[PDB]
Enzyme design. Sequence first.
Site, PDB file in Angstrom:
ATOM      1  N   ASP A   8       0.891  -1.139   0.000  1.00 51.85           N
ATOM      2  CA  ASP A   8       0.000   0.000   0.000  1.00 51.85           C
ATOM      3  C   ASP A   8       0.950   1.215   0.000  1.00 51.85           C
ATOM      4  O   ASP A   8       2.038   1.109   0.527  1.00 51.85           O
ATOM      5  CB  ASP A   8      -0.879  -0.107   1.241  1.00 51.85           C
ATOM      6  CG  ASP A   8      -1.386   1.201   1.718  1.00 51.85           C
ATOM      7  OD1 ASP A   8      -1.681   2.051   0.879  1.00 51.85           O
ATOM      8  OD2 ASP A   8      -1.519   1.363   2.938  1.00 51.85           O
ATOM      9  N   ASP A  10       0.274   5.367   0.258  1.00 50.71           N
ATOM     10  CA  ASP A  10       0.086   6.455   1.198  1.00 50.71           C
ATOM     11  C   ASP A  10      -0.040   5.858   2.584  1.00 50.71           C
ATOM     12  O   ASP A  10      -0.803   4.951   2.803  1.00 50.71           O
ATOM     13  CB  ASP A  10      -1.185   7.253   0.883  1.00 50.71           C
ATOM     14  CG  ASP A  10      -1.020   8.220  -0.274  1.00 50.71           C
ATOM     15  OD1 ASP A  10      -0.018   8.932  -0.348  1.00 50.71           O
ATOM     16  OD2 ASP A  10      -1.933   8.281  -1.099  1.00 50.71           O
TER      17      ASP A  10
HETATM   18 CA   LIG Z   1      -3.008   3.754   2.719  1.00 52.68          CA
END
Ligand SMILES: [Ca+2]
Length: 182
Positions: A8, A10
């Site tokens: 993932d 951010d």
């Molecule tokens: Ca995230």
Amino acid sequence: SVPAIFLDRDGTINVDHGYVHEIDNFEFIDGVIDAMRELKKMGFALVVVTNQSGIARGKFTEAQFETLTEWMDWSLADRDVDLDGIYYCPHHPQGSVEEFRQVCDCRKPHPGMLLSARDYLHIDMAASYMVGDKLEDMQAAVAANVGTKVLVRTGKPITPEAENAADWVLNSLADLPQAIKK
Ligand SMILES: [Ca+2]
Ligand SMILES: [Zn+2]
């Protein structure tokens, strides 16, 4: 077939300031790059799966995403982290940009980006890992058949639900390689 770390972006690789779409606002989390270099050394393919709804919203354009992504890619490769794949979802159901306004299979919690990566690189899912800061990351991983689901504390405080979904909770992506060894 190869094992993989599904990453993932951010809040996992970079600090989440919200709708980050600028190089200037892209800050790598401490130790994440070195850890990624190590994870690679151990033998894992590295694949990024990121939901980028800001594109649908009109916060930033798709091209802007690519410019940040290319830079991110260069910055990592320069540090001996060669990413196996990078996948993103620009869609949202209520998006103000017509091209990107839709329900889709690639938007987490949907497992589409992970499935897509799996077919392309022939990843072995049971042997794989998913690292994220949100419940959808955990949900996509469960759907995708990923063996270990890892949650990180580098985003906003994690929910109990995300925690319920996760197999492991770790301080950072930085701590993953050590965790895998132990
Ligand atoms: Ca995230
Ligand atoms: Zn999508």
